[PDB]
Ligand SMILES: *Cc1c(COP(=O)(O)O)cnc(C)c1O
Ligand SMILES: *Cc1c(COP(=O)(O)O)cnc(C)c1O
């Protein structure tokens with residue numbers, strides 16, 4: 001029977017890796033990486049995180065089955081982290097999931113469970129995993145203009161124009177902050193207008209919050225998400241702890257369902273718990289416990305925020321340097337957008353030909369859509385990248 | 395939109411878990427004399443060692459780590475492990491491996507039906523219903539003898555066709571505690587090969603029956619006979635790491651090409667569901683399995699657990715024999731595993747819990763690991779008073 005199986009395509013990330021490793025050039029650089037890397041090219045375990053694992057190793061007395069939808073300490077902590085003082089427990093349903101991706105899938109299942117004729121609107125472009133999951137579920141997918149290839153900024157007129165076509169019941173997927181892969185983001189005023197459009201059309205917003213803390217800070221990054229939650233009655237939030245806590249492999253995230261009333265919250269909560277059960281039953285414990293421990297322990301929480309901040313400022317300085325270099329070399333303010341983008345990614349806006357030429361001539365690797373990881377840059381690599389960009393006619 | 399959500403039905407076993415001189419005999423979790431579910435020694439040493447060795451937490455393997463996969467395959471199939479034809483997928487527990495198994499098979503055959511035992515783990519049907527898959531049942535439990543209705547089982551299985559999936563419990567059948575002998579397994583392989591039905595083996599208690607190797611005997615027999623088989627393994631109970639959510643799905647294929655296909659579809663399945671699988675428990679398992687000193691202590695502790703429960707069964711059987719002046723309840727010493735179905739009807743079961751405070755699953759399923767010297771005579775007596 002298994003022979004009938006249709007061949008499924010590889011991740012592609014590995015294909016990028018295999019090529020890079022095979023490159024015999026000693027000066028080769030890799031900007032296609034999708035995780036945070038420090039000065040030495042390592043992806044360290046945050047201090048507080050290592051502190052929580054020591055604490056857990058000495059205090060945990062059993063590993064029996066726990067909460068089906070997550071432990072309360074984690075649910076409350078995450079909600080407060082994302083929504084701050086605005087968290088209305090009475091109408092908020094929470095589900096610990098296997099990473100933010102698990103959160104996305106579950107939100108998709110829940111929405112389709114409540115509305116069979118669901119259509120999803122995704123930005124152009126967006127995280128490929130989004131479209132992939134949707135295609136897999138058989139859900140209809142619609143696109144809304146987002147990245148402006150010329151200015152490398154947000155095409156807000158087009159975004160509004162396209163979202164205006166959403167009907168009540170449809171789902172609109174928004175990146176809370178640090179748009180992956182572009183790096184181009186919406187300002188709070190633009191979020192306010194998006195809110196109006198969402199109220200008008202009656203579409204359900206699904207906010208993918210995976211980089212809280214890598215943009216302008218923890219609170220600032222959650223600002224957009226908080227405006228939507230306060231103005232829109234029903235909101236779905238898929239939060240990831242992978243990057244801002246550096247626990248990628250632990251698989252920790254959570255789905256937040258902001259409802260109109262307590263009765264609906266009870267309905268959504270029951271369905272979420274049901275969904276976990278029909279997929280894997282209980283969610284992973286380790287990472288979630290690390291997170292609640294850091295968040296509830298004043299000392300740890302303080303150190304984590306402090307470390308996250310160092311990371312953020314470090315990347316922000318890298319952006320300014322690259323931008324500075326590009327300005328000095330270009331004799332213009334064309335690549336200024338690099339300094340304006342937020343998050344660890346940025347789409348340069350180079351054509352696949354330019355991307356291929358940059359690799360063949362300069363030994364610099366990046367995703368085929370010209371997305372680079374800011375964290376993979378440094379004092380030695382910045383000048384090279386800048387030169388390459390200017391030389392290939394970007 | 396969300397207000398349109400229909401209320402869902404809660405899980406019975408876990409419902410009791412929430413309800414609980416209270417005597418908890420519900421949820422299938424091992425407990426020690428003091429009613430505690432301890433962290434196994436080797437598992438603890440593995441976590442310490444891990445705290446010192448791990449330098450990063452970056453994303454890892456989509457299908458799980460090479461070490462976990464090789465270790466799991468060897469633990470299950472022993473020297474019957476043919477890597478060139480076996481695909482392995484790390485999942486979120488044994489339950490995740492089941493769901494993944496049903497998704498994999500359904501992809502390969504949109505018209506598959508699943509045969510489950512009568513009775514079977516409630517969660518099996520639940521997921522199948524959710525996925526909208528056709529469920530047939532095969533006779534398995536003999537309400538009279540409390541053993542297995544093997545004649546009825548063979549009867550219903552022969553009616554299965556190629557493309558159908560037969561879900562079997564590798565050992566320690568949940569909730570009955572009634573198991574097949576190796577002779578019975580060979581017989582079953584004959585049926586499976588004649589009808590061409592794909593067996594899906596739920597292996598969640600390797601180690602609680604007769605032994606690590608012995609509990610895998612049936613599974614190893616089907617694997618040597620049937621060219622294509624699926625196994626959903628759970629490390630929740632034999633490693634005592636329930637909450638870590640670790641287990642895996644093995645796809646035994648007839649050839650390398652099909653193996654490549656299966657492995658691809660499996661990785662794709664994790665990617666579209668939650669991307670990467672959880673690392674902590676899987677790392678614990680491979681650390682224990684590949685470290686001689688740790689594996690030896692794990693086996694010792696697991697054997698100690700196994701032997702203990704077996705002692706409890708014999709005690710409960712004896713206690714009852716004295717209290718009933720009969721040997722009707724003899725079957726309790728014959729059953730193997732964590733559970734054993736008594737027979738008490740729904741009304742009897744409910745009476746027992748609402749006054750004696752002893753909770754067992756509505757169908758009279760008791761977790762024998764929940765008993766001890768103190769509570770055994772109490773249980774024996776309580777059922778005598780509930781009569782029949
Ligand atoms: C990383 C990421 C996620 C979540 O990843 P998880 O590892 O599953 O937590 C979700 N959305 C985007 C855009 C991401 O970059
Ligand atoms: C324990 C068990 C499983 C798997 O449990 P997980 O916690 O998901 O590993 C599967 N089937 C049966 C019959 C079980 O008892």
Ligand SMILES: COc1ccc(CCC(=O)O)cc1OC
Nearest residue numbers: 033034035101127129180669670
């Ligand atoms: C495999 O799926 C992923 C791919 C890539 C990433 C890293 C983020 C990125 O490269 O866009 C995460 C994934 O799952 C969490």
Ligand SMILES: COc1ccc(CCC(=O)O)cc1OC
Nearest residue numbers: 281405407408421422489517568
């Ligand atoms: C809710 O699903 C479960 C119920 C019960 C158990 C414990 C095993 C049992 O009691 O049958 C596990 C579950 O998922 C792993």
